[model samples]
Target chain A: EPQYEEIPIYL
Target chain B: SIQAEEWYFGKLGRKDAERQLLSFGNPRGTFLIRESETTKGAYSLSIRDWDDMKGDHVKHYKIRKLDNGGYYITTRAQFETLQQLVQHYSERAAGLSSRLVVPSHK
Candidate 1:
């Protein structure tokens, strides 16, 4: 794997 | 202790939450919680890029509580603790855009 890092929609 | 989740970061700002998302593995769909500044007794659920079009963005939801102290994001489901709420969402997205795939680490 090559990578690293980061749902609800409304309020 | 048992009532809360290990990933629950209380009194943290959304700015710092980004560092955590990167620190804990940028796994899309991974999620975490922090205290809400706007809502004293409420919490915010932060998810890692639930939207692909957003491109390196995060999502947040207002997790409010009832008079009896049960926490809920949507009135449809209520949970006793933050842990239970996350657990419930983990199994089913329900109201969230995505499920709790991974919990942020410290």
Candidate 2:
């Protein structure tokens, strides 16, 4: 698991 | 407009951004298409391997709102190398999306 939150993506 | 680009690059991080700028920037029309991991179900369409050193022209388009009733979609499509391939394939697929499945393209 990525310790960092999965990068947030917005449409 | 400027802020969106900055925000995207910021999230992508400085080093990675530099790398992408160098590797994917050119007269090349290469791009990347991925289902958004963060936005969950949204598609992330980005232009990479394109020239931007002289005038600065990298593009990104986020495609959302294609779902219905909170469910997901499962459209059959082929992986394409360039935008042209994607457009050509989709144009053919658009005619009869459900019943038209003929190898799509080469």
Candidate 3:
């Protein structure tokens, strides 16, 4: 669902 | 208490949360805290961001609970209250996408 999506910048 | 904060939207859904943040001008770093839709006693942090490729978008982070009745996210730096946790993130991204800026408005 991609509910709690995060990114790759800072980990 | 975290309930005393306007940014705390109790029982808000992920879809509406995106709408709320967008209405906040979708500014980089605008965010909000809401009760997790599928997790009991867990909270969610929704933030706005401006990416080089995506242009503008929202990111989400789970504010998970601890066995000690505390909370932490982005790292294990547990905080006694959600207010204090927000305080920590407002100052440091702590591995988050970006530093939390202003709380999103409804």
TM-score: which candidate is best? 3
lDDT of each residue in B1-106, candidate 3, tens digit only: 4655344566676677677777656566766677787776588777766668767666677777777668766444667777787777767775666555564433
Q: Report the lDDT tens digits of candidate 2 across residue range A1-11.
A: 23211223244
Clashes of each: 3, 5, 0
**What clash pairs does model 3 have?**
none
The segments of candidate 1 whose C-alpha lies over 4 angstroms from its true place after superposition are A1-11, B2-7, B22-24, B50-54, B101-106
lDDT of 3 by residue, A1-11 (tens): 35565443353
When 1 and 3 are scored with TM-score, the better candidate is 3
RMSD of every prediction:
7.6, 13.5, 4.2
Of candidate 2 chain B, the 10-residue stretch with the lowest lDDT total is B95-104
Q: Show pairs that collide, candidate 1.
A: A5-B26, A6-B26, A7-B47
* Predicted complex 2: CAPRI docking category: incorrect
Rank list by DockQ: 3, 1, 2
* Deviation (Å) of A10 in candidate 1: 12
Segments in model 2 whose C-alpha atoms lie over 4 Å from true places = A1-11, B1-21, B24-26, B49-57, B68-85, B88-106
Interface RMSD of 2: 12.4
lDDT of 1 by residue, B75-98 (tens): 767798777887788778756665
Candidate 1 TM-score restricted to chain A: 0.16
Estimate candidate 3's RMSD in Å: 4.2
lDDT of 2 by residue, B1-106 (tens): 2122311332343234335644643332322333454564454333333344665343443323333322111232323222333444334432112111122212
Q: After superposition, how far is residue B72 of candidate 1 from its true place, in Å?
A: 0.6
